[PDB]
Amino acid sequence: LYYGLNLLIPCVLISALALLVFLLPADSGEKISLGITVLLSLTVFMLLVAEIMPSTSDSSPSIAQYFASTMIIVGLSVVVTVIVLQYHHHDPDGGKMPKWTRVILLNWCAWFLRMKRPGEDKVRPACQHKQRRCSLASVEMSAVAPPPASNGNLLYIGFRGLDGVHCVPTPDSGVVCGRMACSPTHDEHLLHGGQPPEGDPDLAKILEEVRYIANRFRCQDESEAVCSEWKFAACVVDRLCLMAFSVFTIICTIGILMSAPNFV
Amino acid sequence: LYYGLNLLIPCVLISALALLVFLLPADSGEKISLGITVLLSLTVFMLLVAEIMPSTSDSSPSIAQYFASTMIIVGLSVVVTVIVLQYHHHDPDGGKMPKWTRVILLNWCAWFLRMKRPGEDKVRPACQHKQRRCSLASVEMSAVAPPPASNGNLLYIGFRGLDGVHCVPTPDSGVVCGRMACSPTHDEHLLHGGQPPEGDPDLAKILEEVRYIANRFRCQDESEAVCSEWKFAACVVDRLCLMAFSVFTIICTIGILMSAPNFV
Amino acid sequence: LYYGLNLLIPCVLISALALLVFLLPADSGEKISLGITVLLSLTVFMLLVAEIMPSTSDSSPSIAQYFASTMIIVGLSVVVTVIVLQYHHHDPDGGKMPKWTRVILLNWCAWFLRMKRPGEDKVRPACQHKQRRCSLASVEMSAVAPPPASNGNLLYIGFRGLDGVHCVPTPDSGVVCGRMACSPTHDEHLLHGGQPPEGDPDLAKILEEVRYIANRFRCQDESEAVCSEWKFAACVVDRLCLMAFSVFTIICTIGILMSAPNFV
Amino acid sequence: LYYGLNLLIPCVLISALALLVFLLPADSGEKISLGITVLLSLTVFMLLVAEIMPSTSDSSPSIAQYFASTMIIVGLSVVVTVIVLQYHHHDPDGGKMPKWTRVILLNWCAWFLRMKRPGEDKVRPACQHKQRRCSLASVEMSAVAPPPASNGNLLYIGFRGLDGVHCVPTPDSGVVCGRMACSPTHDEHLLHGGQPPEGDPDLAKILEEVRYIANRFRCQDESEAVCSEWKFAACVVDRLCLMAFSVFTIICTIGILMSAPNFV
Amino acid sequence: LYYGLNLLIPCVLISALALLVFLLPADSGEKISLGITVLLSLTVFMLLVAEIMPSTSDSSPSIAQYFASTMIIVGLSVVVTVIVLQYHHHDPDGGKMPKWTRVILLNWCAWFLRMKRPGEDKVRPACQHKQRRCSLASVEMSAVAPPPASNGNLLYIGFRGLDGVHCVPTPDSGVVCGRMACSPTHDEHLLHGGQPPEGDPDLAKILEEVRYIANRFRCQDESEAVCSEWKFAACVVDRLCLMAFSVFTIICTIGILMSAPNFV
Ligand SMILES: CC[C@H](C)[C@H]1O[C@]2(CC[C@@H]1C)C[C@@H]1C[C@@H](C/C=C(\C)[C@@H](O[C@H]3C[C@H](OC)[C@@H](O[C@H]4C[C@H](OC)[C@@H](O)[C@H](C)O4)[C@H](C)O3)[C@@H](C)/C=C/C=C3\CO[C@@H]4[C@H](O)C(C)=C[C@@H](C(=O)O1)[C@]34O)O2
Ligand SMILES: CC[C@H](C)[C@H]1O[C@]2(CC[C@@H]1C)C[C@@H]1C[C@@H](C/C=C(\C)[C@@H](O[C@H]3C[C@H](OC)[C@@H](O[C@H]4C[C@H](OC)[C@@H](O)[C@H](C)O4)[C@H](C)O3)[C@@H](C)/C=C/C=C3\CO[C@@H]4[C@H](O)C(C)=C[C@@H](C(=O)O1)[C@]34O)O2
Ligand SMILES: CC[C@H](C)[C@H]1O[C@]2(CC[C@@H]1C)C[C@@H]1C[C@@H](C/C=C(\C)[C@@H](O[C@H]3C[C@H](OC)[C@@H](O[C@H]4C[C@H](OC)[C@@H](O)[C@H](C)O4)[C@H](C)O3)[C@@H](C)/C=C/C=C3\CO[C@@H]4[C@H](O)C(C)=C[C@@H](C(=O)O1)[C@]34O)O2
Ligand SMILES: CC[C@H](C)[C@H]1O[C@]2(CC[C@@H]1C)C[C@@H]1C[C@@H](C/C=C(\C)[C@@H](O[C@H]3C[C@H](OC)[C@@H](O[C@H]4C[C@H](OC)[C@@H](O)[C@H](C)O4)[C@H](C)O3)[C@@H](C)/C=C/C=C3\CO[C@@H]4[C@H](O)C(C)=C[C@@H](C(=O)O1)[C@]34O)O2
Ligand SMILES: CC[C@H](C)[C@H]1O[C@]2(CC[C@@H]1C)C[C@@H]1C[C@@H](C/C=C(\C)[C@@H](O[C@H]3C[C@H](OC)[C@@H](O[C@H]4C[C@H](OC)[C@@H](O)[C@H](C)O4)[C@H](C)O3)[C@@H](C)/C=C/C=C3\CO[C@@H]4[C@H](O)C(C)=C[C@@H](C(=O)O1)[C@]34O)O2
């Protein structure tokens, strides 16, 4: 098959090259460029088949259907990568502003490690002991702090006190002025050798400027987390479309091997 | 319709792909690249129709008119994205320097949440109570501070005092030297245990350098606001042209379905 | 005119699209990309006219002359944008190193607000009063400080003292040690309660490191001014060529409307 | 050989140009752009050979196979450069997340200076003296610190103490409170002239903010090391494929010079 | 000459456009993009000449030789710009790691101002006085500091002391403890009014963190010097190839004007 080895083989190769675009990180600035070349290569080989196809009036050759399916996968791949830029900015005038989908996306992003589907939800250790039970710590519906861990749960309790123990220690523990744990024990006359405890009020003003500089850097780290939160929502879309297009790509290959004996 | 399923179908798909360019944020550096490919793909199919069209002398086929309208939408899409770069820089030698349009653009940008048109101006809660009334706070024509809020109104009063209460507290409240609210009560002999209140004049000099570093970082945050202000003015242009070109795109599709029975 | 409404029309549109390149800021990194597409689109339509033109031996059709003029404007537009990168770097091994043209460019850049040509030099307020007179302040040929203003003249006197009043106050004003203006009045025994005026020599060392960090940030702001100075010299080149190419573009359009009745 | 000097010559030149892509650093953002042009040029020359090849039904000319090998080398070069972006991000949702290959890659990266293969493992100084012997310092399997050196071994012991001598000096050396080496010799009454050793508790708070700013900058240097660690793993892939494709390129060239006498 | 004014003219124009690539700074990120378009435009015109050239078996027209020289100049221009990226990173796994050429390149870079060739070495002031003589200061082969100047020689002596006078003042000048030049004159009892000279040991710890932050910024300035050092080595390559290709371009133009009367 001269036409089956120079025109059908590139059809699956072009679609297969688009699958790599769905396995790349959302932070890649050159990802959109790669997807453009895939669509460009399809048009180069599409013109050759146009001349072969007879110029009829209402009889559309079945070869055009195969190219349409391939173009949709390649065309949608570029659009999918373009949508990634919206998440990185989410501008009020344009982007993924509606939050009704962000909550759903966040749950899907956290399902990558433990998918709710039977593929991973059921294929995992299971027992009737306390390892799979529930308690007050696990159920945070009543404003219960999550179990401390190294994944970021400790930081949410300490750093993100939210007018809590970190900022305002409402519980009267009696440690600041009732214990010698690096603090005076109700010692109201603890002077700095006859001078006020603070050697210079100017130091407090310097701390405000220094703290603001440190606070601005802290916001930069938090800004990256916000960008990372949108980054995760951008990679799942590529992964979600990778599986959806995988079935379509397989179907197209099957159709070619199944329709050739009847037409070709 | 052999030519209708291979040449007319991409005509509306190419114009539809340009609509996504109008829904992207102005901060996307690769937005211009996406629009270039849309125009490039139109030229590939335009050459094929040229051979089909008879080489006449003064009889212009109606098919060329459709391509002109399609190219205008695609061509203007790239131009619109190019204009976005002007707002991000607004260089004195080139860009949107004239401010007579900036004021109008600012009002339009703020209308996204509450459009002045009947679509959103009239479709909203309305009552004759004080919720829809006016007072001194709402009317800021007489240099009246706006109602404090979390949207940035509090910062304009406190941080942006403009030689006001923050910088020069003209009102004689008698708190700095007439109250014990973290300040002496007319205590001119409040010495630091016999020493001057300031332990070292060098600390003040350090504060000036530290404050300048913090001030420079503050200007960077304000610079982003200026860029954000121009960013909003850039996204509205894309959104404004999206609706304008939507009607034209629909008209072109209607014309094809209405002119084919008479010509095709 | 089948070929006049399909081939001649894009000829002036392609040249008009290059005019937008000359109205963009010099800081746009994607400006060069836009100019490339303009030249690429001209080649697509150029090949079509090649077949139409008879393959003669020494008879060059007049249509080729129009394409040469159009390509020069489009070709020079890309080169002009390429030259912009040289100003942003001005590397010793390559760029606009010779300063004999920088001085002339600086004067031209400052003429944008008040052009020396009669278009703006003569069209402006004029009177015989002191508003248009000259004095010592205006004439800075004898090392006279310019009149203080908010455009940056005050900063050149204060911040850029250059071993002047800011750094070395040569005039014996008798204020530091002869007035109570935030300084001792010749009080050589003004001790810090029996201790040296400086509470710790280590604070001076910290100031040097803090000052260096602040000084480095100051140089970054000055570096932007140097880039801005080259940025202005880059935008004038685009603006200068915009007017020059505007006349050529008009001439080409006139020639087509004037040569067609004799040839076409 | 009219077709050998116009079509066969560029075949090896196109593949040779792809070798430079594998010799570029992984931090180059324009590396992917260079590889795109190489594939684009191959397609331009491939269309010319299509017309020459007779349009048979099932007799595929052997020239097609030669182009397939060249396309694989050029096609895979772009894919290899695309994979580099995955290492720079290694996002959890996409990239080189599995660490089972990272350990192997790290060993390969360190083999560049001293390859385990006989080419460099055997071609090097060898002796039976202590220079090639092993001891406790060389064998770090029992948590033995590596021999201090300037390659980064000293920093791993001092800076990266990991609750060791740098942080918690468990060994009772008796130097802090038992020696005059810039510390008191069990002097519990060493007061600051009657005042506490610390002149102001506010200084400790300032150090925490200053230390955090310095610590954040330290993490930036460590972040570059992590990026450099992935950078090394990205360059070896280019180098690893450079040798593999070199043999294939040589084979393709030999085939042309060996098959031409039988076919051409 | 119908083909001489339509096909030969762009041949020299395409090669001339590549000369601008060799006059651009090495820091231009879009320099590689410009060179790609030059090669792309050559292929458009190359295909047209292919049809004109008769399809012979072993008779290669001389027109192909002219295109080969043009393609080499244009092809090498892109490669030269690609090599620039290698110098900016010089990764151990890829780049200009061998230093045997860096020393030679450094000497060539410094020859731009005063070329060793007779063009500039001989065309310059020359006299037998001490201006062109040599002394100990000029000859630094015996670890002699170079004459201090504003070109960067003073900083190498003071800032880059290398355990010298800046760090360890070995010469016993007797100024720190033997002169009143801002230091005690052997005054071992110079206390801070009865207190230790240092008011707080915590200030020393703060200086270490502040110094590290300043030191890191100093390394960034030194990092740019390393990049600038590689930048100079990258611009000379472009300049070196500019002169080499200038002769070849002139030869190609001469050949066309010399071979046309015999062939054309
Ligand atoms: C695995 C294929 C994918 C697409 C891979 O292709 C690559 C790598 C990338 C993909 C992963 C590239 C590809 C070559 C393939 C490897 C294949 C071959 C070298 C040859 O074919 C094989 C398989 C083929 O049977 C599928 C088989 O025919 C038999 C069995 C069939 O019954 C199942 C039967 O009907 C048939 C009658 O007899 C055949 C004998 O032998 C070779 C024939 C294919 C060459 C294809 C290239 C030649 O010019 C083309 C052009 O330049 C283009 C644009 C892409 C090239 C390409 O795409 O080249 C190209 O189309 O690898
Ligand atoms: C919603 C359509 C848009 C264009 C979508 O297109 C895509 C996705 C993107 C758009 C959202 C891509 C498109 C396919 C379409 C889906 C359509 C089909 C698979 C087929 O058509 C449908 C609809 C069509 O009736 C509009 C209908 O005809 C009937 C009803 C008509 O009366 C209303 C009547 O007159 C007519 C006589 O009988 C038909 C039977 O069935 C299929 C025929 C279309 C194939 C088109 C592709 C084939 O090679 C082309 C080439 O490669 C190119 C450059 C783009 C491709 C494409 O553009 O492919 C391509 O042109 O989806
Ligand atoms: C204002 C024109 C500029 C170029 C603008 O063009 C755009 C916007 C961009 C520019 C600012 C794009 C352009 C359409 C125009 C608007 C014009 C029309 C829709 C029609 O034309 C008008 C004007 C024309 O008279 C100049 C007039 O003819 C009359 C008067 C003449 O005497 C002065 C006389 O001699 C003549 C015999 O009868 C005509 C009847 O009606 C429409 C007919 C033009 C179609 C455009 C062409 C179709 O495919 C061409 C090309 O393959 C491509 C890539 C794009 C098209 C285009 O270029 O589309 C294209 O070239 O707007
Ligand atoms: C200085 C030339 C360089 C290439 C410059 O070209 C540009 C600017 C860039 C370069 C610096 C661009 C160029 C135009 C030139 C300026 C030249 C003209 C407007 C005309 O030509 C002149 C010179 C020519 O004699 C060299 C002369 O012929 C005479 C003397 C010859 O004896 C020496 C003799 O043999 C001959 C028989 O009669 C001629 C009469 O008059 C104009 C006629 C040239 C048209 C240009 C061509 C038209 O489409 C071509 C190509 O498809 C394309 C893409 C661009 C065009 C171009 O290349 O346009 C193109 O190739 O400027
Ligand atoms: C080292 C070659 C590589 C490809 C280098 O090519 C470059 C530089 C880049 C590579 C490193 C580019 C190349 C030219 C070559 C230098 C070669 C020549 C100027 C000529 O050829 C040589 C070698 C050739 O023998 C291999 C030899 O034939 C002999 C010996 C053969 O027996 C071994 C025997 O069978 C045969 C019958 O008689 C020949 C006489 O003399 C010249 C003839 C080739 C020119 C080719 C160019 C001309 O238009 C072409 C077009 O534009 C294209 C797309 C690429 C060009 C190119 O590719 O140009 C081009 O195809 O250098």
Q: Reduced to 3 states, what is the DSSP secondary structure of residue A59?
A: coil
Q: What are phi and psi of D91, to 5 degrees?
A: -65, 145
Cα separation, A45 vs A23, in Å, equals 26
List Cα–Cα distances, C186 to B149, C166, C183, D185, in angstroms.
53, 21, 9, 46
| Angstroms from D129 CA to nearest CA on chain E | 31
Q: What are phi and psi of D94, to 5 degrees?
A: -170, 130
Residue position matching structure tokens 């529930």: A134
CA E6 to ligand 4: nearest atom: 50
Cα separation, E8 vs E52, in Å, equals 13
> Residue D179 carries which side chain, given as an amino acid letter?
R
Q: Reduced to 3 states, what is the DSSP secondary structure of residue E94?
A: strand
C-beta separation of C101 from C95 below 8 A? no
Q: What is the DSSP letter of A257?
A: H
- Counting as contact any 3 or more CB pairs under 8 A, the partners of B are A, C
Nearest CA-CA partner of A22 in A79, A96, A90: A79
List Cα–Cα distances, B13 to A72, A149, B41, B253, C181, in angstroms.
11, 51, 11, 11, 76
Cα separation, A47 vs A53, in Å, equals 10
Burial (CB count within 10 angstroms: exposed 0-12, middle 13-18, buried 19+), residue D190: exposed
Q: What are phi and psi of B186, to 5 degrees?
A: 55, 35
Q: Which of E28, E48, E204 sits opposite C202 (nearest CB)?
A: E204
A34 in a structural domain: yes
Q: How far is the CA of A69 from the centre of ligand 5 (A)?
A: 43
Determine whether the interchain pair C207/B212 forms a contact, defined as Cβ–Cβ distance below 8 Å.
Answer: no
C-beta separation of C13 from C74 below 8 A? no
Cα separation, A211 vs D212, in Å, equals 10
Cα separation, A175 vs E69, in Å, equals 86
Mapped to the 3 state alphabet, what secondary structure does C77-113 carry? HHHHHHHHHHHHHCECCECCCCCHHHHHHHHHHHCCC
**Residue A46, CB-side half-sphere exposure with 13 Å CA sphere:** 20
Q: Which residues of A182-209 are buried (b: 16+ CB within 10 A; e: fewer)?
A: eeeeeeeeeebeebeebbbebbeebbeb
Residue ID of nearest Cα to ligand 1 atom 28: A5
B154 in a structural domain: no
Nearest CA-CA partner of A76 in A115, A119, A19: A19
D127 in a structural domain: no
Q: Give CA torsion, residues A3, A4, A8, A13, to 10 deg.
A: -110
C211 in a structural domain: no
Cα separation, A78 vs A73, in Å, equals 9
Best mutation site among D113, D210, D241 for testing chain E: the one with the most E CBs within 10 Å? D210
**H-type alpha helices, A22-62:** 31-52
Q: Residues of E with CB below 8 A from C44's CB?
A: none
Q: Reduced to 3 states, what is the DSSP secondary structure of residue A56?
A: coil
The number of angstroms, rounded, from the C-alpha of E183 to the middle of its chain's C-alpha atoms is 45
Q: How far is the CA of B7 from the centre of ligand 1 (A)?
A: 30
List Cα–Cα distances, B224 to A228, B159, B218, B221, B230, in angstroms.
20, 17, 10, 5, 10
C-beta separation of C42 from C74 below 8 A? yes
The DSSP line for B117-154 is: SHHHHTSS---SSGGG---TTT--TTSPPPPP-TTTHH
Q: Provide the token pair at C149.
A: 């203003």
Nearest CA-CA partner of A209 in C216, C211, D209, D201: D209
Nearest CA-CA partner of E81 in E229, E259, E242, E225: E242
Q: What is the DSSP letter of E126?
A: -
Q: How far is the CA of C9 from the centre of ligand 3 (A)?
A: 6
Q: Reduced to 3 states, what is the DSSP secondary structure of residue A91?
A: strand
C-beta separation of D233 from D87 below 8 A? yes
**H-type alpha helices, chain B:** 9-21, 31-52, 62-89, 100-110, 118-121, 153-158, 202-263
Residue ID of nearest Cα to ligand 1 atom 36: A1
Q: Which residues pair with B195 in a beta bridge?
A: B192
Q: How far is the CA of E6 from the centre of ligand 4 (A)?
A: 8
By residue count, chain E amounts to 264
B81 in a structural domain: yes
C-beta separation of E197 from C201 below 8 A? yes
Residue position matching structure tokens 């083999």: D111
**H-type alpha helices, C137-201:** 153-158
- Residues whose CB falls within 8 Å of the CB of residue B71, separated by 6 or more in sequence, listed in order: B39, B42
Q: Which residues of B232-261 are buried (b: 16+ CB within 10 A; e: fewer)?
A: bbbbbbbbebbeebeeebeebbeebeeeee
List Cα–Cα distances, A102 to A108, A115, A153, C129, in angstroms.
10, 18, 21, 68
Q: Tell me the CATH number at A45.
A: 1.20.58
Q: Reduced to 3 states, what is the DSSP secondary structure of residue B195?
A: strand
CA A1 to ligand 1: nearest atom: 37
CA A58 to ligand 2: nearest atom: 37
CA B43 to ligand 3: nearest atom: 54
Burial (CB count within 10 angstroms: exposed 0-12, middle 13-18, buried 19+), residue A105: buried
- Residues whose CB falls within 8 Å of the CB of residue B128, separated by 6 or more in sequence, listed in order: none
Cα separation, B70 vs B12, in Å, equals 8
Cα separation, C247 vs C251, in Å, equals 6
Burial (CB count within 10 angstroms: exposed 0-12, middle 13-18, buried 19+), residue A221: exposed
Cα separation, A24 vs A31, in Å, equals 7
Cα separation, B189 vs E3, in Å, equals 100
Ligand 2 pocket check: which of B7, B9, B20, B38 to mutate, most ligand atoms within 8 Å of Cβ? B9
Q: How far is the CA of B256 from the centre of ligand 3 (A)?
A: 19
Structural domain boundaries, residue E252: 1-52+62-123+204-264
Q: Which residues pair with A94 in a beta bridge?
A: A91
List Cα–Cα distances, B43 to A57, B118, C66, C139, D64, in angstroms.
23, 41, 22, 61, 29
CA A4 to ligand 1: nearest atom: 35
Q: Residues of B with CB below 8 A from C1's CB?
A: 57-58
The number of angstroms, rounded, from the C-alpha of B156 to the middle of its chain's C-alpha atoms is 20
- Residues whose CB falls within 8 Å of the CB of residue D100, separated by 6 or more in sequence, listed in order: none
Cα separation, C257 vs C8, in Å, equals 10
Nearest CA-CA partner of A252 in A82, A18, A2: A18
Q: Provide the token pair at D38.
A: 């190489």
Cα separation, A200 vs D183, in Å, equals 27
C-beta separation of B43 from C45 below 8 A? no
Interior CA angle at D157 toward D152 and D160, to 5°? 90
Burial (CB count within 10 angstroms: exposed 0-12, middle 13-18, buried 19+), residue A254: exposed
Q: Provide the token pair at C239.
A: 């603006």
Determine whether the interchain pair C209/E206 forms a contact, defined as Cβ–Cβ distance below 8 Å.
Answer: no
Cα separation, A33 vs C110, in Å, equals 41
CB C137 less than 6 A from any atom of ligand 4: no
Nearest CA-CA partner of D17 in E35, B37, E234, E49: E35
Nearest CA-CA partner of A207 in B242, D26, D202: D202
Q: Reduced to 3 states, what is the DSSP secondary structure of residue A101?
A: helix
Cα separation, B93 vs B91, in Å, equals 5
Query: How were these coordinates obtained?
Result: NMR
C255 in a structural domain: yes
CA D1 to ligand 5: nearest atom: 37
Q: How far is the CA of E17 from the centre of ligand 5 (A)?
A: 24
List Cα–Cα distances, C76 to B171, C79, E74, in angstroms.
65, 5, 19
Q: What is the DSSP letter of A184?
A: -
The number of C-beta contacts closer than 8 angstroms across B and C is 113
Q: Reduced to 3 states, what is the DSSP secondary structure of residue E204?
A: helix
> Residue C65 carries which side chain, given as an amino acid letter?
Q
Best mutation site among D93, D191, D223 for testing chain A: the one with the most A CBs within 10 Å? D93
Burial (CB count within 10 angstroms: exposed 0-12, middle 13-18, buried 19+), residue E85: buried
Q: What are phi and psi of D169, to 5 degrees?
A: -75, 80
Best mutation site among C38, C209, C210, C213 for testing chain E: the one with the most E CBs within 10 Å? C209
Q: Provide the token pair at B218.
A: 């503050």
Q: How far is the CA of E62 from the centre of ligand 5 (A)?
A: 12
Q: Provide the token pair at B91.
A: 């260089």
C-beta separation of A80 from A237 below 8 A? yes
Residue ID of nearest Cα to ligand 1 atom 13: D68
List Cα–Cα distances, D155 to D9, D221, E260, in angstroms.
54, 13, 71
D156 in a structural domain: no
Helix (H) / strand (E) element for A75: namely helix A63-89
Q: What are phi and psi of E141, to 5 degrees?
A: -70, -20
C-beta separation of A47 from B44 below 8 A? yes
Q: Provide the token pair at A154.
A: 């400790």
Q: Provide the token pair at B59.
A: 């009889």
Cα separation, E203 vs D10, in Å, equals 69
C-beta separation of C230 from C88 below 8 A? yes
Cα separation, A97 vs A92, in Å, equals 6
C-beta separation of B184 from B177 below 8 A? yes
Q: What are phi and psi of C91, to 5 degrees?
A: -65, 145
- Residues whose CB falls within 8 Å of the CB of residue D208, separated by 6 or more in sequence, listed in order: none
Give the number of other Cβ atoms within 10 Å of residue D103's Cβ. 9
A177 in a structural domain: no
Q: Which of D90, D196, D216 sits opposite A192 (nearest CB)?
A: D196
Q: Is A60 left (phi over 0), alpha (psi -120 to 50) or beta?
A: beta
Nearest CA-CA partner of D226 in D122, D71, D121, D96: D96
C-beta separation of D187 from D195 below 8 A? no
Give the number of other Cβ atoms within 10 Å of residue C166's Cβ. 12
Q: Provide the token pair at B230.
A: 């121009």
**Residue C58, CB-side half-sphere exposure with 13 Å CA sphere:** 1
Determine whether the interchain pair B207/A202 forms a contact, defined as Cβ–Cβ distance below 8 Å.
Answer: yes
Give the number of other Cβ atoms within 10 Å of residue B43's Cβ. 13
Q: Provide the token pair at A107.
A: 């749950």
Residue ID of nearest Cα to ligand 5 atom 35: D1
C-beta separation of B25 from A89 below 8 A? yes
| Angstroms from E209 CA to nearest CA on chain D | 6
The DSSP line for A143-155 is: SPPPPP-TTTHHH
By residue count, chain D amounts to 264
List Cα–Cα distances, D91 to A220, B250, D85, D226, in angstroms.
19, 42, 10, 14
Interior CA angle at D76 toward D72 and D77, to 5°? 120
C-beta separation of A73 from A16 below 8 A? no
Cα separation, A137 vs A142, in Å, equals 10
Cα separation, B83 vs B87, in Å, equals 7
Nearest CA-CA partner of A235 in A120, A111, A130, A135: A111
List Cα–Cα distances, B182 to A208, B144, B175, B185, C245, in angstroms.
17, 30, 9, 9, 70
Determine whether the interchain pair D20/E82 forms a contact, defined as Cβ–Cβ distance below 8 Å.
Answer: yes
- Residues whose CB falls within 8 Å of the CB of residue A71, separated by 6 or more in sequence, listed in order: A39, A42
**H-type alpha helices, chain E:** 9-21, 31-52, 63-89, 100-110, 118-121, 153-158, 202-263
**Residue B223, CB-side half-sphere exposure with 13 Å CA sphere:** 8
**Residue C160, CB-side half-sphere exposure with 13 Å CA sphere:** 10
Cα separation, D60 vs D253, in Å, equals 20
Q: Residues of B with CB below 8 A from A48's CB?
A: none
Cα separation, C40 vs A39, in Å, equals 18
C-beta separation of E86 from E96 below 8 A? yes
List Cα–Cα distances, B126 to B116, B132, B135, in angstroms.
14, 7, 17
Mapped to the 3 state alphabet, what secondary structure does chain D carry? CCCHHHHHHHHHHHHHHCCHHHHCCCCCCCHHHHHHHHHHHHHHHHHHHHHHCCCCCCCCCHHHHHHHHHHHHHHHHHHHHHHHHHHHHCECCECCCCCHHHHHHHHHHHCCCCCCCHHHHCCCCCCCCHHHCCCCCCCCCCCCCCCCCCCCHHHHHHCCCCCCCCCCCCCCCCCCCCCCCCCCCCCCCCCECCECCCCCCHHHHHHHHHHHHHHHHHHHHHHHHHHHHHHHHHHHHHHHHHHHHHHHHHHHHHHHHHHHHHHC
Q: Which residues of E11-27 are buried (b: 16+ CB within 10 A; e: fewer)?
A: bbebbebbbbbbbbbbb
Count of structural domains within chain E? 1
Q: Taking CB atoms and a 6 Å cutoff, what residues make up the pocket around ligand 5?
A: D 1, 5-6, 9-10, 12-13; E 60, 64-65, 67-68, 71-72
